[PDB]
């Protein structure tokens with residue numbers, strides 16, 4: 001499914017994302033927008049390392065979830081990558097939280113660094129009443 005902007009903001013807020021590890025809800029929104037366009041079914045296969053990025057947050061199969069086909073895989077979220085392709089994003093949110101508890105935090109996502117970090121992201125939550 002493709003979440004509508006405010007629908008996702010409210011969902012992430014309900015799931016405890018606002019301020020998680022100091023990450024504002026607007027930053028999570030910016031991350032989701034640039035990673036997947038708010039699409040829970042998005043997948044990006046990287047033929048080089050043979051890993052695939054899954055779901056709304058584009059979490060990678062080499063370090064975070066198991067897709068049973070990625071070389072050098074550690075499954076830090078102890079979770080099937082299939083759980084990251086569900087309309088229900090609770091599993092994805094729990095894994096996203098695990099990712100950001102590592103030293104880099106949300107900087108783990110290159111797209112977020114390039115399109116969101118240090119920039120005004122207030123437009124992502126404006127009018128959502130969150």
Ligand code: NA
Nearest residue numbers: 065073074075
């Ligand atoms: Na893995």
